[PDB]
Amino acid sequence: SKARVYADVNVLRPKEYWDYEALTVQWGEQDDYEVVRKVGRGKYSEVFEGINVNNNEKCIIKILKPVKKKKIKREIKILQNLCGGPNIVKLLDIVRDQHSKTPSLIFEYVNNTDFKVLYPTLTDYDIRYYIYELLKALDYCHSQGIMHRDVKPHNVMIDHELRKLRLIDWGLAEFYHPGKEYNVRVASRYFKGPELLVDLQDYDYSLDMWSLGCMFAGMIFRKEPFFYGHDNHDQLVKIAKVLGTDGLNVYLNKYRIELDPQLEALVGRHSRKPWLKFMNADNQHLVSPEAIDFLDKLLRYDHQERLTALEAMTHPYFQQVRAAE
Amino acid sequence: SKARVYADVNVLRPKEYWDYEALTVQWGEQDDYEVVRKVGRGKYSEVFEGINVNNNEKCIIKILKPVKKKKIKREIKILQNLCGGPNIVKLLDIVRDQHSKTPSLIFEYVNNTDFKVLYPTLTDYDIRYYIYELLKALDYCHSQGIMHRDVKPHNVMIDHELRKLRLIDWGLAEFYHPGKEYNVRVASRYFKGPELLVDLQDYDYSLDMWSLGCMFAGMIFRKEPFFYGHDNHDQLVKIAKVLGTDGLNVYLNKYRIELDPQLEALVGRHSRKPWLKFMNADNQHLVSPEAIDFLDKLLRYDHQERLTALEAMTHPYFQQVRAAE
Ligand SMILES: CN(C)c1nc2c(Br)c(Br)c(Br)c(Br)c2[nH]1
Ligand SMILES: CN(C)c1nc2c(Br)c(Br)c(Br)c(Br)c2[nH]1
Ligand SMILES: [Cl-]
Ligand SMILES: [Cl-]
């Protein structure tokens, strides 16, 4: 398997673009940035609103938990490669504690509203709008030779009053190289593609398009998360209960993959459930034939069959958003 | 049925853009342009290479056969609306014989090579290239509220040494208005969509996308024309012998259309023929999985299901063409 687009980007670029292991970090001044208040957190970090003492501007400070040289250089390099692209969070500076040498990444500030409070208030048009903004980001990083590998609402920051969107947390991102076999332990569970769940390791940018379909589905049907599995095997089963096992089977045959026996039994046999059966009284104002058609073309087993980011931005679902632009 | 894109263009524009019947033509000087040699012809005209005596530049002169005021004002207005758009033939002047008042349209010159001689020489890449150039034209006129309604190789002029392409003959073109019922006697027979052949009159820009799929199919399989019918009923039958009647049936039910009894019998019952069965030793160098995937998404019964021009330009078939650009 190889990507159907952007496949030779890293082949054509000079090796310094992608050989992140060769990077030498140019540390900035730790004292330039002061912590004002905690605002988020995760497995690999703690995040605060900060102030740049030089200009008194707001910023975001991501203090890293102890991390391997290899891992952090990958995140920094990718962020520097993407800085300035459409709706990509901007990395402003890199600094670290002298005594402990704990690294911090410094980012632009965003007045985000957690998706559990904000998404219930979004109109039909609002949803088209914000998802179009997310696609710009994704087409950009793919075209720069990079897969995000952790798309999900928690990693999409939004200022609703300004209506501005940023794609954050580049911790799992990686450069695409034709035929390379990748680690499948990426993404977040409710958003993992079938490739990750059946151990197909030569995957590509198209993984991110599955994750986006998962997110999009949660929003129009107001059912979050859409595929609600408890573990990786159950995750594959919940998908199978909607998409159907026949297409899962044609998928495994073409890639010549075999399911763990245990897996196979849990999955079972199931007929496809059409998307209007998800429609109901709390979501009836958001489900339209164009929303469903766009969704349908993202959530496919065969990664090679999904819309690219570039194709998705042209779907008539977004026609109004494009016209306003 | 309504278009899925560009539907309100003529609604939003001032009435002078589309009310062609109100046009007052501003005739130019007949003597400015001298006939040098005949180069083409058709049902409604005769076409010559000419010279602009002022600047000694080459041009093309389209002398019209006797035509109704309504009809010619439609063609002129549409041409003036589109002049300067990507790969649209440029209308330079309009003139007429004083004694007889025979109208002539004056156009830019193109050193075209008839498709029966040129297409056999085109490489795989050449085909991607020229078809991408045709799509630019089509997305442009759709976005300007106009359907071409006669797409076909005879109406695509090409200078192979310069590799430049122009979409010509706007004689059947018309403005799109939501819900209007159109005359189905348009297009050329080998390129007519199923809508025209079953008498569905509220069709839209998507008609042109069928015609393009017909052309494209002829080129990669080197089978011209691809659907070779002798009359309108036989035309529908040849299509049915490839696409299959089941999808034809789901089509007629959704639009609530009934087939002439006579028609129904000729058509019959047929299973779909997959596109690789057309592959053979004289076309094996042009048929690729991406060519076939793109084709497949143009040739659909349901006009509402076809790719738009804008979506088609993003298909990975054209990835190399886009990169070079
Ligand atoms: C939890 N985590 C990794 C995270 N939270 C963030 C928030 Br809140 C903002 Br606003 C920004 Br900008 C970025 Br960068 C963030 N990174
Ligand atoms: C037969 N017909 C209607 C027709 N033939 C054309 C040719 Br040959 C050229 Br080159 C141009 Br430019 C245009 Br306009 C043409 N129009
Ligand atoms: Cl982050
Ligand atoms: Cl013409």
DSSP A154-206: GGEEEETTTTEEEE---TT-EE--TTPPPPS--S-GGG--HHHHTT-----TT
User: How many CA atoms, within 13 angstroms, populate the side-chain half-sphere of residue B302?
Assistant: 15
Q: Provide the β-strand partners of residue B242.
A: none
* A20, A72 Cβ separation under 8 angstroms: no
Nearest CA to ligand 1 atom 7: A40
* A307, B314 Cβ separation under 8 angstroms: no
Structural domains of chain B, with CATH: 1-18+110-325 (1.10.510.10), 19-109 (3.30.200.20)
Give the active site residues of A: 150
Pairing status of strand A174-175 against strand B45-52: unpaired
Q: How far apart are CA A219 and CA A119, in angstroms?
A: 7
Q: Provide the β-strand partners of residue A94.
A: A105
DSSP A58-73: EEEEEEEPS--HHHHH
B38 phi and psi angles, rounded to 5 deg? -70, 140
Nearest of A69, A87, A86, A79 to residue A106 by alpha carbon: A79
Nearest of A98, A124, A125 to residue A324 by alpha carbon: A125
Helix/strand/coil percent split, chain A, to 5: 40, 15, 45
* A107, A89 Cβ separation under 8 angstroms: yes
Preceding amide of A120 cis, omega within 30: no
Q: How far apart are CA A260 and CA A257, in angstroms?
A: 10
Asked whether the beta carbons of residue B5 and residue A308 sit closer than 8 angstroms, the reply is: no
* Angle made by CA atoms A200, A45, A112, in degrees to the nearest 5: 95
Atom of ligand 2 nearest to the CA of B166: 12
**Element containing residue B143 per DSSP (H, E):** helix B124-143
Q: How far apart are CA B81 and CA A250, in angstroms?
A: 50
* A275, A296 Cβ separation under 8 angstroms: yes
The CA-based dihedral angle spanning residues A291, A295, A296, A297, taken in that order and rounded to the nearest 10 degrees: 110
Q: Which two tokens stand for residue A56?
A: 């008194």
Name the structure determination technique. Answer: X-ray
Minimal CA separation from A115 to chain B, in Å: 30
Q: How far apart are CA B143 and CA A101, in angstroms?
A: 57
Asked whether the beta carbons of residue A5 and residue B311 sit closer than 8 angstroms, the reply is: no
Matching residue, tokens 């005769």: B46
> 10 Å Cβ neighbour count for A183?
10
DSSP B204: -
Query: A76 vs A13, A81, A150, CA distance in Å?
Result: 18, 9, 16
Spell out the residues 6+ positions from residue B295 whose beta carbon is closer than 8 angstroms to its own: B213, B216, B217, B220, B275
Minimal CA separation from A7 to chain B, in Å: 10
Coil vs helix vs strand at B90:
coil
Mutate one of A319, A321, A325 to test the B interface: name it (highest B CB count within 10 A).
Answer: A319
Q: Which two tokens stand for residue A60?
A: 């975001």
Quoted resolution (Å): 1.8
Query: B129 vs B155, B165, B197, CA distance in Å?
Result: 17, 10, 31
Give the CA diameter of chain B: 63
Q: Which two tokens stand for residue A46?
A: 């703690």
Query: A233 vs A194, B47, B217, CA distance in Å?
Result: 11, 69, 44
* Angle made by CA atoms A82, A87, A93, in degrees to the nearest 5: 50
Q: How far apart are CA A58 and CA A50, in angstroms?
A: 6
Q: How far apart are CA B268 and CA B239, in angstroms?
A: 12
Q: How far apart are CA A162 and CA B22, in angstroms?
A: 46
Mutate one of B144, B319, B322 to test the A interface: name it (highest A CB count within 10 A).
Answer: B319
Coil vs helix vs strand at B192:
coil
Sequence letter at residue A8: D
* B103, B79 Cβ separation under 8 angstroms: no
A309 to chain B: closest CA residue = B314
The CA-based dihedral angle spanning residues B285, B286, B292, B293, taken in that order and rounded to the nearest 10 degrees: 100
Return the beta strands (E) in chain B as ranges.
33-42, 45-52, 57-64, 91-96, 103-107, 146-147, 156-159, 164-167, 174-175
Q: Which two tokens stand for residue A279?
A: 């429609």
Q: How far apart are CA B138 and CA B236, in angstroms?
A: 25
Q: Provide the β-strand partners of residue B156.
A: B167
Query: A158 vs A59, A75, A167, A211, CA distance in Å?
Result: 15, 22, 9, 18
Q: Provide the β-strand partners of residue A34.
A: A51
